[PDB]
Amino acid sequence: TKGEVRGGGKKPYKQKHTGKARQGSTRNPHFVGGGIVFGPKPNRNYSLKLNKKAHTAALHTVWSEKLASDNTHLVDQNLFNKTEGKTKVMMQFLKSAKLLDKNVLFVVNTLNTNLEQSTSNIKNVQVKHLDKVSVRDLMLANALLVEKEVLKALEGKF
Amino acid sequence: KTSMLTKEQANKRRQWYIVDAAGLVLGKLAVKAADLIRGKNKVDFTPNQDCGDYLIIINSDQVVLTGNKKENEFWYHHSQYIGGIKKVSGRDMLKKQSDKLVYNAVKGMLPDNRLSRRWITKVHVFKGDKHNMEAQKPTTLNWS
Amino acid sequence: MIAFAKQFRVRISPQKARLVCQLIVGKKTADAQNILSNTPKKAATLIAKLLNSAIANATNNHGMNGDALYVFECVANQGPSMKRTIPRAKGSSNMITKRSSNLVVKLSDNPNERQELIKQQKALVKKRVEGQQKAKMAR
Amino acid sequence: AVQQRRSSKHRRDKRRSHDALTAQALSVCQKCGKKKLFHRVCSCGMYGDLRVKKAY
Amino acid sequence: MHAIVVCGSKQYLVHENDTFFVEKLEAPVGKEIQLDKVLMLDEKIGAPYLEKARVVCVVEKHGLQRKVNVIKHISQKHHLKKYGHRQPYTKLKVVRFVH
Amino acid sequence: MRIKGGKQTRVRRKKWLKQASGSFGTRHASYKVAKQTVIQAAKYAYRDRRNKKRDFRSLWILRLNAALREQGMTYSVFINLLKKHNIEINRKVLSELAIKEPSKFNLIVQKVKS
RNA sequence: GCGAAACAGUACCGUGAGGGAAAGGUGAAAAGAACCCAGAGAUGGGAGUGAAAUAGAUUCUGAAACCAUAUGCCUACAACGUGUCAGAGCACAUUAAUGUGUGAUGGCGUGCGUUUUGAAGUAUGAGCCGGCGAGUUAUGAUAGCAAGCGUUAGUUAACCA
RNA sequence: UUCUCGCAGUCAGACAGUGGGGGAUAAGCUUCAUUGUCAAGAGGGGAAGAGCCCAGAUCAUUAAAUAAGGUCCCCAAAAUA
RNA sequence: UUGUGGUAGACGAGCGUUGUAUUGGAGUUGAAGUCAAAGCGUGAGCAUUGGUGGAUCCAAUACAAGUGAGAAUGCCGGCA
């Protein structure tokens, strides 16, 4: 800002009896090198407070909307060991499920190492825990693969 | 929208006219001369292009006025040097420069245009009854 | 068929160079040296060498004639100016300009080249209108 | 004094209209083929059929 | 011969195979409009119009005049406004008229 | 995030300058003066958009009067005899243009007399 | 953008505490131009290299005030905040548009900001041009609009994950 | 145009008619009331203007009839007694 | 049907710039900036081909701003 930068606080010219203007400190916004009158400061919260009930209602609405569409399916714990850390099996499964041009988002209540290790080298899909999924992530996928066991906690969560 | 109103395209066919000043009053003679020169009564007159006639006037010194203007109406001409005010009377102009009187009178009523100094040169006067435009073969008419 | 010659960074005022160029422009080459190297002007001496070099380039590097050629355009353009300072009375400060110039000359072999440039301009606008037509023909 | 309104390029052009230098008259020497000045000697010397300078 | 026709908001002089321009009448090109409001057909003087006198006319084209950006500027006061306008019109010729 | 306006400023200035075409002097290049010049030009255009409607009516009446001088009567009585009897909603402009075809306006001149 | 992208608290000013700059970019790679011509030389034109030399060391992109040269048009009797509306004549042919460029002639006319009872001003501010060049943000309150929750409602703050 | 509420700006007025005060029935003077205009509003008449007279300019049109004023010409329209 | 001169100033309806989010696309078969055109909108504006030029950019919807230049006897730089 104006006074933060280093610079002479002296008057470059006598105020009167001079051809030039009344300009004072040489670090004013008129001169070059700095002296911005208005500029962003490192203390701005940028927080957008929203009531909890509205957030819960929005989450329930997006769950209901995306659950009743013909792009989400159920996945159980059985094939989380058939699929290994290696992504070859994951790529074959993706090709079988014709999701090569989709952005399906995973949701599970176990967080197995085999699934997390895979799909980390691909940006189309990602795995997440129930406690960390958000509305934007829930709806940007346009398709979901949901674990059956998670449904109990889902209906408990309202 | 519009009919694209007809305007002249510099068609300058101009007749020659002679008027007998057998004792005409200066004002009416001047306005009639201005009317004849400007072609104001021409059927398709356009004030955007030059379209007029040539007027020859005879017996400049025979032109007479009315009332006591012979000793009341005065003409002043100015020269750019200070003190140069030529003051003349009606009779003096009638006897000394009567061609100048009618010339200036007909010049004054012309609109102050660039064509004003070009429209004026179409008039010509003579103190006597002898003219030099005979080669143009002019036709005369009275009271114009 | 132009075979012009250029010259850069000449220490001479543009106005005098333009004056002498206008004096010499529009003539042949034989009279050029006589009408140019016999005038008390500093810029004339440099233009003499410039015209000699132009004649040499025309006769050698492009295969032109030695008599049908004539000077076509002599101009003077403000070159890269350099600024210094000079003191004045009562400690005054002024910025003095040290002017420079750019001088080029042009030769021709025949009275045209006043229309060939116009021919190229016509070709350019013809290309523009042809492109416009071709774009319009994609409906 | 100084000007009170700036001079236009038209004004300076009309002022310098008289700047064009005259075409100096020349003459051909009678023995040294060259275009010299008028009433003046050429680089050889024979102002007429008579010399004055050595070589230059 | 010489005819005087009235259309849109103005009147026009009409000869054989002549064309002119009028305001739009929401009529497509192709239909032959029978202009009714005509006055002073040669050697006939009717006071408001000429009774049962019409001239048939085929529309030629629809056109838009050049842009005119009228600007009203109030001198030395805080005010500045711009406005542009185009006036559609129709070009039309004459083919036949009846006495 | 700082934003500097380079493109739109140039576009606006070039558009302003382009309207200043056919002028005299540096008024066709100095944007700060070209804008004032074209503003004054627009003001004059607006005023003359009614001045021309006045002047064309003036010239139409002048030429009609001039044409009537060859028949003996005056313009005022001609307008009267047009209006108070033999009513005619006829253009003064076309009554003037009727002189292009000779002797056709003379028919109306004769007929307007009851 | 740190005053400081390049041998910046340097060059520079001041005997002093001290004040305090400006400029970056060829080209994929120098392959940075053998040799010839003009010139004493710089240098330029040819040749060649390189996709391109309008990339040639003035080294990415190259608008404006600057001034040259030229096709097309006009002006040397003319009173001019210079343009508008008509209008020939002249030459041309476009994003086909009742087309374009110039303006012999006619009608009309006293800029822009600011501060002002009041501006063509004989008050004022501006040489032009190019860029930069001010109503935001933190924390509160009131009110309008909209939303969740709904009538023992509503809501979290600091804080932990 | 009365009423709660959001948010204002405005505190240098001038002129013409009308009635008075100051002034000497002098001011393009001042101080008031009052009717309008400008102020913050274009055009026409008055030759040229902020106040005078007609009056409300949304734009375009080369269309008609009037308002104040004017009609030999500039510069639009007329004559008759 | 009425109404649309208008500074301060209240108020609605809007265009442009940068970046993020995304769905679509263009891109040495040539994008940006930039030069010139005799086009399209009620507007701040926006198409088109032609030369320049060698890498990013465009449509549409929201979000957030160092976001719109004619002065400040303004500021540097260049030029009359």
The structural domains of chain D, with segments of one domain joined by +, span 1-56
Residues of D in contact with F25 (CB under 8 A): 8, 10
**Measured at the alpha carbon of residue F27, what is the angle toward residues F26 and F29, in degrees to the nearest 5?**
70
- In this complex, which of D20, D23, D35 lies closest to C19 when CB atoms are compared? D20
**Measured at the alpha carbon of residue F30, what is the angle toward residues F28 and F36, in degrees to the nearest 5?**
80
> What backbone torsions phi and psi does residue C55 show, to the nearest 5 degrees?
-60, -45
Find the chain B residues whose C-beta atoms sit closer than 8 A to any C-beta of F. 3, 5-6, 40-47
Closest CA to E57 of E89, E22, E99: E22
Which chain B residue's Cα is nearest to E4? Answer: B3
Any idea which nucleotide's C1' is nearest the CA of F76?
Answer: H78
The answer to whether some atom of strand I lies closer than 7 Å to the beta carbon of E83 is yes
Strands in A5-151 per DSSP E:
73-75, 105-108, 126-129, 144-147
β-bridge pairing E3-7 and E38-39: antiparallel
End-to-end CA distance of chain A, in Å? 50
Chains that touch D (3 or more CB pairs under 8 A): C, F
**Measured at the alpha carbon of residue F27, what is the angle toward residues F24 and F33, in degrees to the nearest 5?**
155
| Two structure tokens written together for D19 | 């700047």
Domain residues for the domain of E53 are 1-99
How distant, in Å, are the alpha carbons of D34, F13, F15 from that of D47?
Answer: 12, 67, 68
Q: Residue E81: enclosing H or E segment and its boundaries?
A: strand E81-85
- d(Cα A44, Cα A75) in Å, to the nearest integer? 43
For residue A126, the Cα-to-chain-centroid distance in whole angstroms is 13
Smallest CA–CA distance, residue F77 to chain E, in Å, is 18
Closest CA to E72 of E60, E61, E82, E57: E82
- In this complex, which of E40, E71, E73 lies closest to F90 when CB atoms are compared? E40
CATH number at residue C35: 3.90.470.10
* Residue with CA nearest to H40's C1' atom: E77
- Residues B20, F46 contacting (CB under 8 angstroms): no
- d(Cα F23, Cα F44) in Å, to the nearest integer? 14
End-to-end CA distance of chain C, in Å? 43
Domain ranges of chain F: 1-114
Q: Which residue has the tokens 């159920």?
A: A74
Residues of F in contact with E2 (CB under 8 A): 98, 101, 104
Using the Cα atoms of residue A24, residue A25, residue A26 and residue A27 in order, give the sign of their dihedral. Answer: negative
Q: F67 burial class (0-12, 13-18, 19+ CB within 10 angstroms)?
A: buried
Q: Residue A33 gets which letter from DSSP?
A: S
Which residues lie below 8 Å from residue D7, measured CB to CB, with a gap of 6+?
Answer: none
Longest dimension (CA), chain D: 62
Give the ranges where chain C is alpha helix by DSSP (H): 14-24, 30-36, 42-60, 116-136
F88 touches E: beta carbon within 8 Å: yes
Q: Which residue has the tokens 């005299």?
A: F24
* Nearest 10 degrees: Cα torsion D41, D44, D48, D51: 110
Strands in chain B per DSSP E:
16-20, 54-58, 74-78, 85-89, 123-125, 139-140
F39 touches E: beta carbon within 8 Å: yes
- The count of structural domains within chain C is 1
The answer to whether some atom of strand I lies closer than 7 Å to the beta carbon of D6 is yes
Which residues lie below 8 Å from residue B30, measured CB to CB, with a gap of 6+?
Answer: B102, B105, B106, B109
Contacts across the B-E interface (CB distance below 8 Å): 12
- d(Cα B138, Cα B54) in Å, to the nearest integer? 9
Smallest CA–CA distance, residue B94 to chain F, in Å, is 34
Task: List strand G contacts in C 54-93 (CB < 7 A).
Answer: 56-57, 60-62, 73, 75-78, 80
Closest CA to C19 of D24, D9, D19, D15: D19
- Which amino acid is it at D39? H
**Burial state string for E57-93 with b = 16 or more CB within 10 A and e = fewer than 16:** bebeeeeeeeeeeebebeeeeeeeeeeeeeeebbebe
How distant, in Å, are the alpha carbons of B62, B93, B97 from that of B84?
Answer: 29, 18, 18
Please give the method by which this entry was determined: cryo-EM
**Burial state string for C33-54 with b = 16 or more CB within 10 A and e = fewer than 16:** eebbebbebebbebbeebbeeb
Task: Tell me the β-bridge partners of E55.
Answer: E35, E97
**Burial state string for D13-49 with b = 16 or more CB within 10 A and e = fewer than 16:** eeeeeeeeeeeeeeeebeeeeebbeeeebbebbebee
- d(Cα F61, Cα F56) in Å, to the nearest integer? 9
Give the resolution to one decimal, in Å.
4.9
- d(Cα E13, Cα A36) in Å, to the nearest integer? 71
> What backbone torsions phi and psi does residue E15 show, to the nearest 5 degrees?
-120, -175
Q: E8 burial class (0-12, 13-18, 19+ CB within 10 angstroms)?
A: middle
Task: Tell me the β-bridge partners of E92.
Answer: E20, E59
- d(Cα E14, Cα E3) in Å, to the nearest integer? 5
DSSP notation for B83-123 = T-EEEEEHHHHHHS-HHHHHHHHHHHTS-SSTTHHHHGGGE
* Residue with CA nearest to G47's C1' atom: C61
Q: Residue A94: enclosing H or E segment and its boundaries?
A: helix A88-96
- Residues A54, A145 contacting (CB under 8 angstroms): no
Closest CA to E36 of E22, E51, E54, E23: E54
- d(Cα B39, Cα B20) in Å, to the nearest integer? 19
Count of C-beta atoms within a 10 Å radius of residue C133:
9
| Two structure tokens written together for C107 | 């030769």
Closest CA to C30 of C72, C79, C66: C66
Q: Contact E73/F39, CB-based, under 8 Å?
A: yes
Which residues lie below 8 Å from residue E38, measured CB to CB, with a gap of 6+?
Answer: E3, E4, E5, E6, E49, E50, E53, E54, E55, E97
| Two structure tokens written together for A64 | 């209901």
- Which amino acid is it at E88? P
- Residues B38, B119 contacting (CB under 8 angstroms): yes
β-bridge pairing A105-108 and C70-77: unpaired
- Residues B26, B65 contacting (CB under 8 angstroms): yes
β-bridge pairing C82-87 and C101-108: unpaired
- d(Cα D38, Cα D51) in Å, to the nearest integer? 16
How distant, in Å, are the alpha carbons of A30, C113, E2, F3 from that of A35?
Answer: 8, 57, 80, 17
Which chain H positions have some atom within 7 A of a protein CB? 40-41, 43, 57-65, 72-80
The answer to whether some atom of strand H lies closer than 7 Å to the beta carbon of F43 is no
β-bridge pairing E88-93 and E55-64: antiparallel
- d(Cα A5, Cα A2) in Å, to the nearest integer? 6
Length of chain F: 114
Give the distance, in angstroms, between residue A30 CA and nucleotide I71 C1'.
14
Task: List strand G contacts in F 54-83 (CB < 7 A).
Answer: 55
Task: List strand H contacts in B 39-58 (CB < 7 A).
Answer: 40, 47
C74 three-class SS:
strand
E43 touches F: beta carbon within 8 Å: yes
- Residues A53, A158 contacting (CB under 8 angstroms): no
Task: List strand H contacts in B 106-125 (CB < 7 A).
Answer: 109, 111-112
